[PDB]
From a paper:
We solved high-resolution crystal structures of full-length [name] and its individual carbohydrate binding module family 42 ([name]) and GH43 domains, including a structure with L-arabinofuranose molecules bound to the [name]. The predicted 580 amino acid protein consists of an N-terminal signal peptide (residues 1–19), a [name] domain (residues 29–160), a GH43 domain (residues 179–488), and a C-terminal dockerin I domain (residues 511–568).
At the optimal pH and temperature, [name] and [name]_GH43 had specific activities of 4.95 ± 0.28 U/mg and 5.67 ± 0.63 U/mg, respectively, on pNPAra, while [name]_[name] showed no activity on pNPAra, with U defined as mM/s of released pNP. CBM6 domains commonly bind directly to polysaccharides such as xylan and amorphous cellulose, while [name] domains typically recognize small AOSs or the terminal nonreducing arabinofuranosyl residues of arabinan or arabinoxylan. Previously, Ribeiro et al. expressed these three [name] domains as isolated truncations and tested their binding of various natural substrates, finding they most strongly bind arabinoxylan and arabinan. In the previous study of this [name] by Ribeiro et al., residues D39, D91, and D136 were individually altered to alanine.
Residue numbers in the entry: 7 to 143
Write the structure that this text describes.
Amino acid sequence: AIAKLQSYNYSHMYIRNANFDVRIDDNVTPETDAQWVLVPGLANSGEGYVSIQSVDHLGYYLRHWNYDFRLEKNDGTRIFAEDATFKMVPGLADPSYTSFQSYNYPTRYIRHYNYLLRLDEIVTALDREDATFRVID
């Protein structure tokens, strides 16, 4: 499914590709920078696992490299797949929304740190809000 990923706590902002960097922003141009294909997890086909593919750069996925995020072309490896697969879980700040738990670092979640996208431990209530997104498809 093609989706937009809206920040729970900054609801005018969306996860977007910015010349292969990853950030949240409002007023996203081109609009396809903010559009993603949620596909079955590259590292696991089971229920709830997803990989997040860029719409305007097919074959490119949100991939964490340690705790940073990049939009990277799939090199076919299991390690890439694991760094690019997330469990979609009920929102940490509000279960009606969505959070993205890392497949290979299960205590870490996708979160925006200000405008940047990171894979962090989620300790505080603000961390939970930074790690919660509305999936709009």
